[PDB]
From Swiss-Prot, chain A:
Subunit structure: Homooligomer. Component of the nucleosome remodeling and deacetylase (NuRD) repressor complex, composed of core proteins MTA1, MTA2, MTA3, RBBP4, RBBP7, HDAC1, HDAC2, MBD2, MBD3, and peripherally associated proteins CDK2AP1, CDK2AP2, GATAD2A, GATAD2B, CHD3, CHD4 and CHD5. The exact stoichiometry of the NuRD complex is unknown, and some subunits such as MBD2 and MBD3, GATAD2A and GATAD2B, and CHD3, CHD4 and CHD5 define mutually exclusive NuRD complexes. Component of the MeCP1 histone deacetylase complex. Interacts with CDK2AP1. Interacts with CHD4. Interacts with ERCC6. Interacts with HDAC1.
Protein name (Swiss-Prot/TrEMBL): Transcriptional repressor p66-alpha
Tissue: Ubiquitous, both in fetal and adult tissues.
Effect ascribed to mutating K14R: Disruption of MBD2-binding, loss of enhancement of MBD2-mediated repression and loss of speckled nuclear localization
Disulfide bond entries: none
Role: Transcriptional repressor. Acts as a component of the histone deacetylase NuRD complex which participates in the remodeling of chromatin. Enhances MBD2-mediated repression. Efficient repression requires the presence of GATAD2B.
Domains as described in the record: Both CR1 and CR2 regions are required for speckled nuclear localization.
Modified residues (Phosphoserine): S2
Chain intervals for the UniProt region annotation (CR1): 9-43
Covalent crosslink: Glycyl lysine isopeptide (Lys-Gly) (interchain with G-Cter in SUMO2): K43
UniProt feature coiled coil, ranges: 4-39
Subcellular location: Nucleus speckle; Nucleus; Chromosome
Curated annotation (Swiss-Prot), chain B:
Protein's name in the database: Methyl-CpG-binding domain protein 2
Compartment(s): Nucleus; Chromosome
Full-sequence portion shown in this chain: 360 to 393 of 411
Subunit (UniProt): Heterodimer with MBD3 (via N-terminus). Component of the MeCP1 complex that contains HDAC1 and HDAC2. Component of the nucleosome remodeling and deacetylase (NuRD) repressor complex, composed of core proteins MTA1, MTA2, MTA3, RBBP4, RBBP7, HDAC1, HDAC2, MBD2, MBD3, and peripherally associated proteins CDK2AP1, CDK2AP2, GATAD2A, GATAD2B, CHD3, CHD4 and CHD5. The exact stoichiometry of the NuRD complex is unknown, and some subunits such as MBD2 and MBD3, GATAD2A and GATAD2B, and CHD3, CHD4 and CHD5 define mutually exclusive NuRD complexes. Interacts with CDK2AP1. Interacts with DHX9.
Gene: MBD2
Function: Binds CpG islands in promoters where the DNA is methylated at position 5 of cytosine within CpG dinucleotides. Binds hemimethylated DNA as well. Recruits histone deacetylases and DNA methyltransferases to chromatin. Acts as a component of the histone deacetylase NuRD complex which participates in the remodeling of chromatin. Acts as a transcriptional repressor and plays a role in gene silencing. Functions as a scaffold protein, targeting GATAD2A and GATAD2B to chromatin to promote repression. May enhance the activation of some unmethylated cAMP-responsive promoters.
Tissue distribution: Highly expressed in brain, heart, kidney, stomach, testis and placenta.
Organism, scientific name: Homo sapiens (Human)
């Protein structure tokens, strides 16, 4: 049943989880960045 | 312009909820190191 394979998936999902969350946190900052003083940068 | 990108409060919530689900499978699948 390749037990290691099951554990490997967890590790892989763990890495993507951090990256996936990172973007989420950044997105939140963008929302608050458009509230104060317009949004300076258009991108 | 119209083809611009605007982030909505809800759209953001759906993103967080989706991620939360992934974590669940992480801690859950991890909590079964001996069970599974």
């Amino acid at each position: 049943g390749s037990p290691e394979e099951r554990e490997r998936m967890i590790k892989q999902l763990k890495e993507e989880l951090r990256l996936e969350e990172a973007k989420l946190v950044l997105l939140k900052k963008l929302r608050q960045s458009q509230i104060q003083k317009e949004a300076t940068a258009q991108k | 312009g119209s083809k611009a990108f605007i982030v909505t409060d809800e759209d953001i919530r759906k993103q967080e909820e989706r991620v939360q689900q992934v974590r669940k499978k992480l801690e859950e699948a991890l909590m079964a190191d001996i069970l599974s």
